[model samples]
Target: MIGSEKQVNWAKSIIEKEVEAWEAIGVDVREVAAFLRSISDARVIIDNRNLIHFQSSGISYSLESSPLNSPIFLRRFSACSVGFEEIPTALQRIRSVYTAKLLEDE
Candidate 1:
């Protein structure tokens, strides 16, 4: 929902760059940075700009085994930089769990 058309297209472009990166110099840090800037970074910026914000959060470089995948998430996140259906589901699940926890606190 937060993604715009240009953002989605840019995301696809990043995916392509990621592929090229794997084939070229083993890993394209510049491309990866550009990709994140275009997508995740942009989204986070926009969210903050609109005051739809959260406190400092941590990012996980590794993923634990669950219904999503034993190790697939890591490959997708670091390597391909794309989600394979499981990520979104996992995201929704996590969001729901967190929101519920917050609600309970209130």
Candidate 2:
């Protein structure tokens, strides 16, 4: 899976909360993440190789450092929606970044 069950659940709640907050401000994001998650359970994975190779023309994917392990990554995605309209347009243009924090014990 793109993220561990615990991490994904955390991410889902985070995204959903953000969406709700944005909607409260009168900016509708159309629940694109919820829709995507609903449609895709097998679609998510932790491999950046898969993400980078896939045609991400209309979507955005980001990877971040996990506090748990260096090998573990926090994968996230945002679909094209109202206030986030820039996501699609900026997809290919944005560069991928590896998190600066390494495994503390390593």
Candidate 3:
């Protein structure tokens, strides 16, 4: 994902909200420290990764991040969605990200 600090911050907020929606009510993004970004918003420039570019091109995949952790990642997950228009112009690029906040005590 490529964007100004402000843009990036804005994008993360949206994704974090989504996380809250999907996860249990007890979930707070601060707990996971979600490192997130959006491919749906038009204002952001996201041509960074090959797989990510592929998703943004025209095809959209909805992946779910499974929390399920013991110690390795301290709970990490990733998912993405793409929005496409008729002309093949990506209207909504994606809403996805990888989130992880190390165990505070660690």
Candidate 4:
């Protein structure tokens, strides 16, 4: 399934909040925000009962879940002191998985 405008909005808010958090700690995270903004398209693909894929800019990113193994998707990041930790993780994941295809391609 393709990502909706609402999903993009949610993603934007998440990335924005994390960027501020990193800046508050004297770290520059504008690049992360910039890459997120470059995402021309976003999609949500339900892989199965345990995995949900979030595809951004032609790159597929997955979010896994299991009632018996874990709770909701966000719960996976419960260890984060601040909620926005996922933003950095997402950014790094994208960088690692699609460096030549996404980041470096542009």
Q: Which candidate comes out best when scored by TM-score?
A: 4
For model 1, give the 10-residue run with minimal summed lDDT.
59-68
Residues 2-95, model 1: lDDT tens digits: 5676765555554454446333422223433443343443343333233312223331221121322434423433433444434446444654
Instruction: Please count the clashing residue pairs in each candidate, in the order shown.
Output: 0, 3, 3, 1
TM-score of each: 0.27, 0.30, 0.25, 0.32
Which residue runs of candidate 1 sit more than 4 Å off their true CA positions?
A: 26-106
| Model 2 per-residue lDDT tens digits across residues 1-106 | 4545676665455445544643443224354344333423333422232432323232222222211112222223333123233443332232222122233335
Over 1-106, each residue of candidate 3 has an lDDT whose tens digit, in order, gives 4446687666555555545643433233332323333244324223222212222222212222222122222212223322211111211111222222223335
Collision pairs in model 3: 39-93, 39-94, 40-94
Q: Please report how far candidate 4 places residue 27 from its true position, in Å.
A: 2.4
TM-score pick, better of 3 and 4: 4
Ranking the candidates on lDDT from highest down gives 4, 1, 2, 3
RMSD of each: 14.6, 14.5, 16.1, 15.2
lDDT of each: 0.40, 0.34, 0.32, 0.41
Model 4 TM-score on a 0 to 1 scale: 0.32
Clashes by residue pair, model 2:
1-45, 2-44, 2-45
Model 1 TM-score, 2 decimals: 0.27
Worst 10 residues of 3 by lDDT: 84-93
